[PDB]
Design a protein around this nucleic acid. Structure first.
Lengths: 97, 145
RNA sequence: GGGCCUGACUGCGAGGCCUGCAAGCCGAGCAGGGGCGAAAGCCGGGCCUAGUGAACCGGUGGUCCCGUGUGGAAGGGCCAU
RNA sequence: UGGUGUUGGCUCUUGGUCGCGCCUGCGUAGGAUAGGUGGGAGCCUGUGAACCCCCGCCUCCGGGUGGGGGGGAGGCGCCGGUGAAAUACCACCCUGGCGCGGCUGGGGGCCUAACCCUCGGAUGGGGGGACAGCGCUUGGCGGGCAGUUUGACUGGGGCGGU
RNA sequence: CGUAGGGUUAGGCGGGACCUAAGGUGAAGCCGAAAGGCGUAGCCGAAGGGCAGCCGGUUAAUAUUCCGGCCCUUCCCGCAG
RNA sequence: GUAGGGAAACCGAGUCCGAACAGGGCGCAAGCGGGCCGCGGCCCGCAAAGUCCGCGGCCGUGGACCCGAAACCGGGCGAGCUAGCCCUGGCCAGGGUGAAGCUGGGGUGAGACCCAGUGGAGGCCCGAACCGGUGGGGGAUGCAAACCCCUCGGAUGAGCUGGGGCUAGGAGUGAAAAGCUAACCGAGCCCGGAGAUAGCUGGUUCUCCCCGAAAUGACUUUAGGGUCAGCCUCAGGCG
RNA sequence: UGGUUCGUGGAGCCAUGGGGGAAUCUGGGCGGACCACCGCCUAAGGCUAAGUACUCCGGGUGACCGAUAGCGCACCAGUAC
RNA sequence: AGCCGGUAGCGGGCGUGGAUCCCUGGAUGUCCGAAUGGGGGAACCCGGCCGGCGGGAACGCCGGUCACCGCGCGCGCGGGGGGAACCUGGGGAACUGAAACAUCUCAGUACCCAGAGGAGAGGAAAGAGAAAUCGACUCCCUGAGUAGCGGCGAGCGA
């Protein structure tokens, strides 16, 4: 999944470490790493679809920022919208950040 | 989370009330359909602005009232009609009392006033004004020749 | 074969065997505290030569040695296993 | 594949719990069935007495208790008796349960409005529907693929043996 | 083969100012750490469709191209119907 | 460098183990003078701990004496060869066999079906172009890094072919041979990581002088390699 | 998960893909788990010369080479092929 | 005081009324190339609009102008590509070392990508860490192969 349109959050590379053994803290002999490998962790992207100035504009956003969409909209009331193109509304919106 | 309801809403609350819901409800039902609004600092205020303003507008309403409580219940009113013993040669609808109180010590309010029909006999009367809810003014009135 | 007993000691260890290293083996004697003996004395497992496993990493007991500004604590060290 | 995010509404039936409402608690003794520890010398009646009948629930079978009905100025405790504990009554908490509701965990159905699909049309309709899809995490299956291992001696190597 | 000089003439032949094929590219739009991958429309893409020239003469070397004869195509202005 | 011992607290010419003021481990002692002076007071020189630089021998880390892999990984370049598919065109002399259908006739209640005529089907037959490549001979520093003569297979089909296109490296394509993917494919080429690594093979360049081994033992994923020991050599010391 | 010397370790600190989710100085983070003291610092906005690196380019100098050397190229070379 | 490149020669010119040559500025600057009107097999092909040329309507030539994207209020301003190394960021191997190998190592190296610029990054403490201390960042020496890290192996290393 791409990048969150609000937070700029974007996939990161991170290791999948596989271990074996009983931990030291559990009186065991220690942990042995039986494999490391590269993976990615994704932002939890989703779709927010809001009506703004009587127009359907949709964000692709991470869950950790869904309400940020809704804060924008509310802020956006005092903005000179209409009868913009959906694209330029969205543009104008993000500018509020 | 928290929302300010714009309308009355079944098992949530009266308009203007602030209730706490699951965000899914809010975002996919309440907010779209102008039923409620998010409880943000920015319209948590508009709650109280509406409140304060409501309180003060009622305050003056119980002010220019308290004028019309001391200035009224503190005079009289004759009526210059004629009278052949009992029952009136003209007749006073509250519209008269309207313009009538608006005549002598004159004075002016806006009827309503308790004259379900107009005054057909003569004598000693005291008519129920009520300019504003929970503020009674009894008012002395005489019908004379 | 029997009597009592726990030396199948704890500190050590002059000097040697053997030996590339690392190990392996023998050990008299001084001290602590004992056993058996009247005593001289003998006893630091087994008539002897096989019955074993270096480090690392962990477990338990003790020790109270370090303890991340300080008091602790976490965790380690040392002794035992 | 479980959990959680995206993910929401409404009922139904069960679980956990917490707010009260209530009734439940059975050795000997002791009037009787004493759940525990405080307040207790008085309580109850026009917030109309013992008795009388019907029922509900309890039963350790003698009782308990809710109400209903007629009666309507009449009945219980400190003392006493008793036992480990003593008494009405005012509490508070149990024990156990029934009902209310908060908050939720299982389910069952239904809804639509997220998501998804579809429709000469669409700030819309029809279908799927909080599933599926996707994010993080859990455990599993996993030569589909990847990195490697697969000892030495040895009258050659292997086999056997060591 | 070396040095030199000459030689390739088109409205009609072939291709372009026409069309579309696979594919390619690609307003819209989707997607992807970046690079970039997709994508109805359009556009690109021919040895496919479309489209008006035949016979002879001439040069050391060109000719459906130059010349000769006969015959056409399109665009422009005009006139008339 | 001037202090060590101890795991450490610490202590310190000592310290650790220990109850020890036994025993033991690891440490601690400084030069050579000659003289002045009323035995070293302590000068003075000479030498030295140590250390700094130069030099040389060797060792560590780097490609580390030089040359050489089979391979691995990254990024690119290739389907003008070849394999498959897509688009659009083209090609296949001649001959032979004679399916279904039809038409006529025979047949039956009507049919089946039979007979002729017609008809012109087919991964049909013969055989050129074309596509193959069976067997043999030749060719073998070739005409040719796959050829030539003779002979042979398909030849209306799952045929052959021009043009335009697409699919590629753990990937393509494959009527399947691990075949083909630009004359060597059990993983293309090129460039880079890169001087990969090579306990293996080869090679190691002037002169004289002195000495002069080993091919054993222990252990070793060791066994044609190593560590230590044995044996060689040089310097200092002992005698 | 990554960064750090830190390979799960007693694992803080810094960064953050997921879930939960505050406060505005009597607030917050840190001093290597945690706690208590004592201290340090003020996160979630940004800009900031110089000292530093390199060498296509110019110049200066070599116990640098001297046409098999030195750049691959002293020459019409990234050419011929 | 010579000169018309490396070049002589044919055949012609210029220069102390200061030429050639060098420096600076300016003019010209075909076609391709980020390539940008559109198309395209780079240096070819084809157009719209405005102005000029020709007898000039058809034809052709000349001059201007016309891509896309990001910002601002149709108009402006920016971007695009390139650059030996050097820099930051987003990704990121393996040979090899461990005398085998998987954790480890080689290494955040090679390389790919994006961006920056004459540098770049960093940069005014939610720092350091034990001093009643220090006081941005970078960079050098030292600290120090110390502290530690580590199949406590190889090795890594503040």
């Amino acid at each position: 999944s791409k990048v969150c349109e609000i937070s700029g959050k974007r996939p990161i590379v991170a290791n999948s470490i596989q271990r074996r053994g009983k931990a030291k803290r559990e009186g065991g002999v220690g942990k042995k790493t039986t494999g490391i490998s590269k993976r990615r962790q994704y932002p939890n992207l989703q779709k927010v679809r809001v009506r703004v100035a009587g127009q359907e504009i949709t964000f692709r956003v991470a869950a950790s920022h869904i309400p940020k969409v809704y804060e924008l909209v509310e802020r956006a009331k005092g903005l000179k919208l209409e009868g913009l193109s959906p694209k330029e509304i969205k543009k104008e919106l993000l500018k509020l950040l | 989370m928290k929302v300010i309801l714009l309308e009355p809403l079944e098992n949530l609350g009266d308009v203007g009330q602030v209730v706490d819901v699951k965000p899914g409800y809010a975002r996919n039902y309440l907010l779209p359909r102008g039923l409620a609004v998010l409880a943000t600092e920015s319209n948590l205020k508009a709650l109280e602005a509406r409140i304060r303003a409501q309180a003060k507008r009622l305050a003056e309403r119980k002010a220019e009232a308290e004028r019309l409580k001391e200035i009224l219940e503190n005079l009289t009113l004759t009526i210059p009609v004629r009278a052949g013993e009992t029952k009136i040669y003209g007749s006073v609808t509250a519209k008269d009392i309207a313009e009538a109180l608006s005549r002598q010590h004159g004075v002016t309010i806006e009827p309503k006033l308790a004259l379900e029909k107009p005054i057909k006999e003569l004598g000693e009367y005291v008519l129920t004004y009520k300019p504003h809810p929970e503020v009674p003014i009894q008012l002395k009135v005489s019908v004379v020749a």
